[PDB]
Design a protein around this ligand. Structure first.
Ligand SMILES: Nc1nc2c(ncn2[C@@H]2O[C@H](COP(=O)(O)OP(=O)(O)NP(=O)(O)O)[C@@H](O)[C@H]2O)c(=O)[nH]1
Ligand SMILES: Nc1nc2c(ncn2[C@@H]2O[C@H](COP(=O)(O)OP(=O)(O)NP(=O)(O)O)[C@@H](O)[C@H]2O)c(=O)[nH]1
Ligand SMILES: Nc1nc2c(ncn2[C@@H]2O[C@H](COP(=O)(O)OP(=O)(O)NP(=O)(O)O)[C@@H](O)[C@H]2O)c(=O)[nH]1
Ligand SMILES: Nc1nc2c(ncn2[C@@H]2O[C@H](COP(=O)(O)OP(=O)(O)NP(=O)(O)O)[C@@H](O)[C@H]2O)c(=O)[nH]1
Ligand SMILES: [Mg+2]
Ligand SMILES: [Mg+2]
Ligand SMILES: [Mg+2]
Ligand SMILES: [Mg+2]
Lengths: 51, 165, 51, 165, 51, 51, 165, 165
């Protein structure tokens, strides 16, 4: 309930293109993504920072 | 160099009120922070990216998601809240173990010092175990977000300590 | 429960940048985002297509 | 032109099995689809982006999130599921109300006709209300994703029907 | 002639993707683009800043 | 003069994101850009066609 | 496969008029083309991105900028313009040397055959030097963009000639 | 906040020499600017996007293409050019009428003060009409891009004037 509002806030920021790398870590953490998927997201994200 | 700071602590400690007290006059127009606030502050002509993370129970578990590349942690503790000072120690102990914060400098704010019943800086330091901290550059300051006292001093110490490194 | 794995699925694909506009519509529907924000997201997404 | 196709219907119909049967031999190595699968399929040297949407109860409400820019719907129905044909009708009537699918052509796959207990294409067409379809270019075919029969005939009619338009 | 080199200079910068919104303004002014077209280009350029 | 309306017509199409790679070729030919700069442009343009 | 065709030829031949005559009724609402027109045309259910380039003097030199990936060239020639047929040849010879057009096929349209003073396809063919074409697939037809005649025939020949290749 | 500054003025005033003098030592290895230059500059640890627009006659009309979102305008004038001070006034009067520069502050640089024939900052201010400026925060300073004299004072004023606002 409080985590849902938290989730939406974080997800809103990410989708609008802000501080996307940090938000990605909280999103995979809150929704307990598996290690494989998590690392796949965190890398493309890094490959995104290059710009 | 532009440092990035984290303002952590339990719900109620006064973290948001502090953030806007810095770099801006003051208006504690405040509501429980379900998420986070980020604002850029300039002290002695320097630049800090300051993150204010909500501290209620359910979201405290996600603090570590932000530890990456942290230079300093301003840890806010409610000086009048004696019933929960042990929980503040717990969270504090846990975060310091974090490998990503090893080189971060710690600054404790014994906030709400404008209140008659607020415990002293010495009692808190001992109650939080600060005296035992090894390999840790720290300091405790008594502050008041509403009255705005003790902040300039703390900022001075933080700015100079890290300019050293 | 089932809807949680589903969301983890739609989100993954979105973060990896695949079929983002469609994924944004299901993500905003599942989590019941408020119209104003849903629209903000679905416009940046439309502008995104111009590339 | 590169058309886009959606494969829809209730859980257990054989939607996923059909998808890979198309543009690939056939290996029903399959598990309930809690999400979706998308593959590019080539028929008469043509190209389509085909979506296979999971059909269990809790996620059927999100099918409409995928209706934009749809050329055709391949509606799969289990020929031996007599208890649930009424439900396949409700979902069919509900999607044909959708403004985004007004121009999409409909092809019904009465799947699992390899089983003795399967209903006839006629029984199915009537129970789905196809005879009363207005402003719609439709048709129903018998199929067996497992045995690989009937799909070719169905795709032929589909491709020709839209090549016209 | 000074104006040509100028135009060539501003065109190069624009086509290499740097400060595209400003270059767009000087390009349509130098070549005297009708109002309709100029406004068309300046909008896409604005929709382009979102990213 | 006839080439000016021409250039404007072509530039408009380019700036509006339509058939950019061909437009790039005619713009650089009409304004006689130097080989180096023209090649720098038509490559960034190519690296764009991957999307 | 989606082929792209370039409509070329001197100014005032009927290039623009012919483009819209294809894939649309006809309305010679036309002005000189100081730039170009691009439209999607469908013949025998096939699809083509057709480019019509303006042909007055000063802009003709930029024709070669569009030759990349060209499948065929519809070359329009004014049947009554006896004074400028020699120039049309110069242009045709120039583009045939172009390395990017090597595999493109040539279709010549002897346009305006509805004018009592139009020369004959045989006269035009010899003047353009078509009887001597080597390693080239070509054919000449007589048309009238205004009356809408001879166009269907030409397209039939073009589509089939490339359907082979 | 990161402010953007425009360096305007007639050809030969020393605008480009000033740009590089700011944020680097000094090497007037310069040629007439037929277009523009842009560079990121840091003063009192602050960030500025600074543009240097060429000033010969035929391209002066395009300065206004860059006026949007301008925080300050450093107007550079040749202190030894007595024949053209009136033309420097025309241009200045014209640009100050621009609605997009309403809230921009003005800082005039009486450049080339290393030359004996350099007119005083007071004569310049009078010939340009600065004293008559209403609703304009402005100041004038004498400088020498080559000798690097006068720039620090100028920048201090600018930096402090905008920190206010
Ligand atoms: N007397 C006093 N009250 C204070 C002080 N600092 C904060 N408060 C009060 O404490 C309350 C909560 O403050 P707030 O800044 O929202 O706390 P927080 O730590 O950000 N809470 P959360 O983490 O939930 O967002 C407010 O009513 C505020 O006025 C202080 O120094 N003195
Ligand atoms: N006898 C028979 N079984 C079939 C046929 N097509 C599919 N099946 C079987 O039906 C079951 C489910 O098929 P599947 O394609 O996964 O169904 P689905 O519609 O994708 N299910 P969901 O929507 O839950 O993802 C499998 O055991 C499969 O082998 C058919 O034509 N005949
Ligand atoms: N009698 C006749 N007139 C025609 C025919 N096709 C075009 N015309 C006329 O010839 C004129 C020029 O035609 P148009 O299509 O504009 O030529 P174009 O080759 O596009 N010219 P440009 O290259 O300058 O744009 C128009 O006035 C048109 O009506 C035709 O088949 N018969
Ligand atoms: N004596 C002297 N010469 C100077 C001074 N500032 C610039 N100059 C000289 O004046 C000349 C032109 O300077 P420059 O910075 O290129 O001028 P500009 O305003 O950018 N010209 P443009 O707008 O045409 O590009 C150079 O030869 C330079 O050395 C100064 O303060 N004193
Ligand atoms: Mg708060
Ligand atoms: Mg399945
Ligand atoms: Mg024309
Ligand atoms: Mg210069």
């Amino acid at each position: 309930p409080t985590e849902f509002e938290y989730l939406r806030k974080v997800l809103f920021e990410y989708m609008m293109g802000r501080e996307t790398k940090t938000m990605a870590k909280v999103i995979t953490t809150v929704l307990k993504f598996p290690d494989d998927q998590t690392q796949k997201i965190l890398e493309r994200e890094d490959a995104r920072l290059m710009f | 160099r532009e440092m990035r700071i984290l303002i952590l602590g339990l719900d109620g400690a006064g973290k948001t009120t502090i953030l806007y007290r810095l770099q801006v006059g003051e208006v504690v127009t405040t509501i429980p922070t379900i998420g986070f606030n980020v604002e850029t502050v300039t002290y002695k002509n320097l630049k800090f990216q300051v993150w204010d993370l909500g501290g209620q129970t359910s979201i405290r578990p996600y603090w570590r998601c932000y530890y990456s590349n942290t230079d300093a942690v301003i840890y806010v503790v409610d000086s009048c809240d004696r019933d929960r000072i042990g929980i503040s120690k717990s969270e504090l102990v846990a975060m310091l173990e974090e490998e990503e914060l090893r080189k971060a400098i710690l600054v404790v704010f014994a906030n709400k010092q404008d209140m008659e019943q607020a415990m002293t800086p010495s009692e808190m330091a001992n109650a939080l175990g600060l005296p035992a901290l090894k390999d840790r550059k720290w300091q405790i300051f008594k502050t008041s977000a509403t009255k705005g006292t003790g902040l300039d001093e703390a900022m001075e110490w933080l700015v100079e300590t890290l300019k050293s490194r």
